[PDB]
Structures are given as C-alpha cells and as structure tokens.
Amino acid sequence: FDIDMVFSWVDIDELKYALRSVNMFAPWIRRIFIATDSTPPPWLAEHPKITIVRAEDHFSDRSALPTYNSHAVESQLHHIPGLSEHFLYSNDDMFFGRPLKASMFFSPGGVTRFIELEHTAVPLRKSVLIEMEREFPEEFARTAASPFRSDTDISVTNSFYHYYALMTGRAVPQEKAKVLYVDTTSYAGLRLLPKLRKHRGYDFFCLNDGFPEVPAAQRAERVVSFLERYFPIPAPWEK
Known part of the structure; x- marks a missing residue:
C-alpha cells in the first residue's frame, strides 16, 4: 500500500532539512503534503512529490477558519484530498536519523507502529480517523474550531489516535526505535x-x-x- 507524509509548518529552515531527511532515509514515501497557511519557502520549487495544503483545502467547517492552532489542523488531516489511507504526520523539527524501513511504521497488514509517545513522525490511518471523528463528533468539531492551542483540544496525532487504535486492534507499540x-x-x-x-x-x-x-x-x-x-x-x- 502507499504511504504519504504530512508536515505542518508555519513561517535555519528546519523544514528544508526535515524534508531532506525524508528524501534520504524514507524513499518509500509517495506524496509529501505541507499543511500550511504560510507563503511557501523561497527554496521550495514546484514538484510532483510536494503538495501545499491550506486549511481551507481540507477543513470540514470554514467557520473554524482562520486557524492558528496546530491541533485544529491535526484534527482534520484525514480530509486532505488525495492523501493515502496510510500516512505519517510530522512537525518541522522532527528528523529521520538514518535509513528507515517502512515496517518501522506500518506492518505489511496495515497495523500502525507508534513509538512510546516519543516526539517522532506518527503513523496514522484515514479510515480510523474518520471513525474517531464519527464517535467523538463534539470534540473533533470543537478542536477544529479552536483558533489557538487550548487545554480543551483533543491531542489526536500525539496521543488520542494511538490509544484508540491500540484498544481497537489497529495499532501496536514500536519497541525497536532509538x-x-x-x-x-x-x-x-x-x-x-x-x-x-x-x-x-x-x-x-x-x-x-x-x-x-x-x-x-x-x-x-x-x-x-x-x-x-x-x-x-x-x-x-x-x-
């Protein structure tokens, strides 16, 4: 199956080097999406592998916009058009350190492998996120519509997803990561x-x-x- 990557970004150029770490160490990644409302960095050329995604391109509710809350963007990743069912999500200060196998993150049967969570790219599934949005509709709506980081936010990508997926048999910890x-x-x-x-x-x-x-x-x-x-x-x- 395909595996994409999504980076969140707001304008050292850490993102330039985080993307180099994907090009060098995760060549099996298909599409890279940059979820941002900023002007693209000047060093970034148009390229079929890179897609810029503004909040308005994937949010359910435009009332939630404009947003300044990475948690709000994180609650809506599974609505990015064209995103593969299996994908990684990362901040711009997270780096791959050496050549990685896809099985670091996903089993051959699609089970996600999360690192216990450590501040690394996290493996996610669109179908599981759709399911959690249906099961926790008020929390997903409120977090998407929260313009600034808030204690009320659900922490989808760094915690809540993995607990939900763990308990429903779709995720297992990654015990072998440094x-x-x-x-x-x-x-x-x-x-x-x-x-x-x-x-x-x-x-x-x-x-x-x-x-x-x-x-x-x-x-x-x-x-x-x-x-x-x-x-x-x-x-x-x-x-």
Whole structure:
C-alpha cells in the first residue's frame, strides 16, 4: 500500500532539512503534503512529490477558519484530498536519523507502529480517523474550531489516535526505535550534535527549543552547521 507524509509548518529552515531527511532515509514515501497557511519557502520549487495544503483545502467547517492552532489542523488531516489511507504526520523539527524501513511504521497488514509517545513522525490511518471523528463528533468539531492551542483540544496525532487504535486492534507499540532529544537552546543539548553527526545510532531525533541559555545567533550557527553536514544532499524539490 502507499504511504504519504504530512508536515505542518508555519513561517535555519528546519523544514528544508526535515524534508531532506525524508528524501534520504524514507524513499518509500509517495506524496509529501505541507499543511500550511504560510507563503511557501523561497527554496521550495514546484514538484510532483510536494503538495501545499491550506486549511481551507481540507477543513470540514470554514467557520473554524482562520486557524492558528496546530491541533485544529491535526484534527482534520484525514480530509486532505488525495492523501493515502496510510500516512505519517510530522512537525518541522522532527528528523529521520538514518535509513528507515517502512515496517518501522506500518506492518505489511496495515497495523500502525507508534513509538512510546516519543516526539517522532506518527503513523496514522484515514479510515480510523474518520471513525474517531464519527464517535467523538463534539470534540473533533470543537478542536477544529479552536483558533489557538487550548487545554480543551483533543491531542489526536500525539496521543488520542494511538490509544484508540491500540484498544481497537489497529495499532501496536514500536519497541525497536532509538530516539534522541536535542535541546538546541542549552549548551548540553548543542553538545549532542557533534556526537550525533559522528556516531549516529538513532532512527529519529528532534530539535527542541526550551528558558534558553544559548544566544540566538550561536544557536542558529551551530544548528545550521550540523544540519548542512548531516543532510548534505539537496532534495529534488529544492530550487
């Protein structure tokens, strides 16, 4: 079966390198959707593999718009036209760390494999999301219509989906994954980057922004330097 990827994004260019990590380490991905209301980045060319999806292109209710809430977008991913039944969802600060097999995320029979959750791309199914929207209609409607991140939001992609799919026999934990968290605003976190670049060992890593102690100028220099070396191949959708 096909497997697509959806990134959420709002305007270092972390997304450029997150997309390089897919091009390098998940070549089996079919379509990449960028769910965003921002102007596309200037480095991004038109390419058959990339589709920009504004909120108005997939939300059930236009009253919910405009939105500034990633949770609202996340509650409506399964309405993206053309999206495959099996897909991954990611933020722009989540990176594939080394070559991945599709079975890291989906069994050959379609069971999703979630990493217990860790801050990584998550595997989802459109049909299961349709089912949860039908079973929790007030929560899906309210979250889609919540213009800012709220305690009332259902946390579909990072928790609720996986618990629902676990209990109904459609998801199982991924016990075999190595994940590194890098706080890029601390010196201890930035010290992880040369060790990660040199020695690898991780299927996934993520670049967090903490109360920073690293000045913004130094953080950008060290992070961009790391990403340029770790992901040196420009993807075919880059100008």
